[PDB]
Design an enzyme around this catalytic site. Structure first.
Site, mmCIF file in Angstrom:
data_model
loop_
_atom_site.group_PDB
_atom_site.id
_atom_site.type_symbol
_atom_site.label_atom_id
_atom_site.label_comp_id
_atom_site.label_asym_id
_atom_site.label_seq_id
_atom_site.Cartn_x
_atom_site.Cartn_y
_atom_site.Cartn_z
ATOM 1 N N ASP A 35 -11.580 -18.365 14.324
ATOM 2 C CA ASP A 35 -10.434 -17.589 13.860
ATOM 3 C C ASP A 35 -9.145 -18.373 14.077
ATOM 4 O O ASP A 35 -8.667 -18.476 15.213
ATOM 5 C CB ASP A 35 -10.423 -16.272 14.628
ATOM 6 C CG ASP A 35 -9.294 -15.369 14.267
ATOM 7 O OD1 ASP A 35 -8.570 -15.637 13.283
ATOM 8 O OD2 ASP A 35 -9.172 -14.358 14.998
ATOM 9 N N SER A 199 4.161 -20.847 1.174
ATOM 10 C CA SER A 199 3.705 -21.192 -0.158
ATOM 11 C C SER A 199 4.903 -21.216 -1.106
ATOM 12 O O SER A 199 5.883 -20.486 -0.932
ATOM 13 C CB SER A 199 2.623 -20.196 -0.627
ATOM 14 O OG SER A 199 2.390 -20.315 -2.016
#
EC number: 3.4.23.22
Length: 330
Positions: A35, A199
């Site tokens: 994770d 992004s």
């Protein structure tokens, strides 16, 4: 030194991935959920409430000649989906794919929430966010990657998750045969303890690219892609019959649909998520309504590039002094 391990979907929807980890002496092999959104290595164990274990493989520190109790240490963690676990702590030897760390904090669960109990394929988590998120108290502990970083040929690990197929976690090297083109690297902020980046935009299907900054975290421990409500609406608007359903808890769509792809920006570069990757199947056995793999983050606080996104790319988690993230197509 380096390490390399195969990671395997736990089911046919790729809800999560498990990777085999060797703990203790002689080795006890457990299948852990790597994770990048958390920083605790915890395992089902001989100390876990018996009623809360159901098929998982447990770690028995009393059978490990290198296990030592970290006196006074405890841990408790709650995850974004509401699950949770807690217990005490040993140090022991931990190896992943031939890479060995001595003195790793292995957090032994006394309690797990029902969702973990109900998932017999995941024996624990191995967190790979920044160690500042580690929940061990009163002495915070380091992640596996932090402990191994010094000894690695390069201070990096990579995630190469497969679509309905096994993939790979590599530590300490870049496998240049695992991707195509070049790796675009992008800035990371550690200020929340996550692999947090920005992004540069998105496109839906064959649609024109929209330049807009989307701050979010690269998170192997989350199944789906959680983006802002505007983005997510623009996507599902392109699927006839798609709608957001409070009863189900998100966007659903006709299982008869052919989904468009989704592109996200990495600097000047572009990663394309095939539409098939966004289909997470009937909301219930036999239903004709299917659950969407792109969902809104408006009830999270953070945008999450989970496995739906990360499995479309080769992902370099660069733990140099100035951490960065790198994405390549594959």
């Amino acid at each position: 030194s380096t390490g390399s391990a195969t990671t395997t979907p736990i089911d046919s929807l790729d809800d999560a991935y498990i990777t085999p980890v060797q703990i203790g002496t002689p080795a006890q092999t457990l299948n852990l959920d790597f994770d990048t959104g958390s920083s605790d290595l915890w395992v089902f164990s001989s100390e876990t409430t018996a009623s809360e274990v159901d098929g998982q493989t447990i770690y028995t520190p009393s059978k490990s000649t290198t296990a030592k109790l970290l006196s006074g240490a405890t841990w408790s963690i709650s995850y974004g989906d509401g699950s949770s676990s807690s217990g005490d702590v040993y140090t022991d030897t931990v190896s992943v794919g031939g890479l060995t760390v001595t003195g790793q904090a292995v957090e032994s669960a006394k309690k797990v929430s029902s969702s973990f109990t109900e998932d017999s394929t995941i024996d624990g988590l191995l967190g790979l966010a920044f160690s500042t998120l580690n929940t061990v108290s009163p002495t915070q502990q380091k992640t596996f990657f932090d402990n191994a970083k010094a000894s690695l040929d390069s201070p990096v690990f990579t995630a190469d998750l497969g679509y309905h197929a096994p993939g790979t976690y590599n530590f300490g090297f870049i496998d240049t045969t695992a991707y195509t083109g070049s790796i675009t690297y992008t800035a990371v902020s550690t200020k929340q303890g996550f692999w947090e980046w920005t992004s540069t935009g998105y496109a839906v299907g064959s649609g024109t690219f929209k330049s807009t900054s989307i701050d979010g975290i690269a998170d192997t421990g989350t199944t789906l892609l959680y983006l802002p409500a505007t983005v997510v609406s623009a996507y599902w608007a392109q699927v006839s019959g798609a709608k957001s359903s409070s009863s189900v808890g998100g966007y659903v769509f006709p299982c008869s649909a052919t989904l468009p792809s989704f592109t996200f920006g990495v600097g000047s570069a572009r990663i394309v998520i095939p539409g098939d990757y966004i289909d997470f199947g009937p909301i219930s056995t036999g239903s004709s309504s299917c659950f969407g793999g792109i969902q809104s983050s408006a009830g999270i606080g953070i945008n999450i590039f989970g496995d739906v996104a990360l499995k479309a790319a080769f992902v370099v988690f660069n733990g140099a002094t100035t951490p960065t993230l790198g994405f390549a197509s594959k």
